[PDB]
Amino acid sequence: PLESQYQVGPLLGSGGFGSVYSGIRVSDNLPVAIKHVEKDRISDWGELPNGTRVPMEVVLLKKVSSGFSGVIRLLDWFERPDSFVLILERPEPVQDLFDFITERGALQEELARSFFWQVLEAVRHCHNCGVLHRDIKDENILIDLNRGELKLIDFGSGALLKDTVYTDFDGTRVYSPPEWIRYHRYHGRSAAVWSLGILLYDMVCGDIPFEHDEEIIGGQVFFRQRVSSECQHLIRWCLALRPSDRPTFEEIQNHPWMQDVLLPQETAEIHLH
């Protein structure tokens, strides 16, 4: 059955992704999130090896849900006549990073460093599994407030990773790179890195660096908050206008600002508990 297995609780929210509810698995009381997507709202379709037309997000979530990681895992999914329903892990207690930054303002560099490292690890894991997320942003990251662990959500704008050009983008504009705004073309990794620079800026300044198309393609970064020279240098590198001037994940993680990261548990103790 569909909803004998899961006890549905309140609506967590809704939007372009569909509608997400809090829930419990009856057989063991595991916290779950239950996401409902209308078939008419799905542009990206895939198929499972067994031959079933599933949304691309299910295909992508299956590729990244083996083993432990900083991605929210797909536990199960159901097809209904007009919709699909995804059963996903749910940290408890949990707050999304957008909501967290709105509440606390700019994050201390120590906390931004831990958070940003964990996002890098999660994106690297996705990339190793053949998956490009394509909508990396604060609203798509959940913080397990007790464990200090960050978790990626929402692969509904994602794609299989390839080495050829993407001419489609359906993620968040203000996190979209200047080469997409100008040419409607990007490559996966270098665009991921740009969105990562938007995130890091967001973390340490408390808001995104660019509002309009024109500021994105001018790509000049003004700091409104006191930020360290090393942190400003990493941001500016991630947000280089030419894709080929951007760092690899390795170069980011080997950056001087990224040295001596707190563990998730220490992060929760110092900063979240």
Curated annotation (Swiss-Prot):
Coiled coil: none annotated. Keywords: Apoptosis, ATP-binding, Cell cycle, Cell membrane, Cytoplasm, Host-virus interaction, Kinase, Magnesium, Membrane, Metal-binding, Nucleotide-binding, Nucleus, Phosphoprotein, Proto-oncogene, Serine/threonine-protein kinase, Transferase, Ubl conjugation. CDD domains: STKc_PIM1. The active site is at D135. It catalyses: L-seryl-[protein] + ATP = O-phospho-L-seryl-[protein] + ADP + H(+); L-threonyl-[protein] + ATP = O-phospho-L-threonyl-[protein] + ADP + H(+). The keyword Kinase applies. Expressed primarily in cells of the hematopoietic and germline lineages. Isoform 1 and isoform 2 are both expressed in prostate cancer cell lines. Its EC number is 2.7.11.1. Induction: By interferon-gamma (IFNG). Strongly induced in leukocytes by the JAK/STAT pathway in response to cytokines. Induced by different cellular stresses, heat shock and cytotoxic agents. It comes from the Eukaryota. GO terms for biological process: apoptotic process; cellular detoxification; cellular response to type II interferon; negative regulation of apoptotic process; negative regulation of DNA-binding transcription factor activity; negative regulation of innate immune response; positive regulation of brown fat cell differentiation; positive regulation of cardiac muscle cell proliferation. It holds the Pfam family Pkinase. ATP binds at L12, G13, S14, G15, G16, F17, G18, S19, V20, K35, E89, D96. Disulfide bonds: none annotated. Autophosphorylated on both serine/threonine and tyrosine residues. Phosphorylated. Interaction with PPP2CA promotes dephosphorylation. Ubiquitinated, leading to proteasomal degradation. GO terms for cellular component: cytoplasm; cytosol; nucleolus; nucleoplasm; nucleus; plasma membrane. One of its GO terms (molecular function) is transcription factor binding. It is an enzyme of class 2 (transferase). Proto-oncogene with serine/threonine kinase activity involved in cell survival and cell proliferation and thus providing a selective advantage in tumorigenesis. Exerts its oncogenic activity through: the regulation of MYC transcriptional activity, the regulation of cell cycle progression and by phosphorylation and inhibition of proapoptotic proteins (BAD, MAP3K5, FOXO3). Phosphorylation of MYC leads to an increase of MYC protein stability and thereby an increase of transcriptional activity. Interacts with RP9. Interacts with HSP90AA1, this interaction stabilizes PIM1 protein levels. Interacts (ubiquitinated form) with HSP70 and promotes its proteasomal degradation. This is Serine/threonine-protein kinase pim-1. It comes from Homo sapiens.
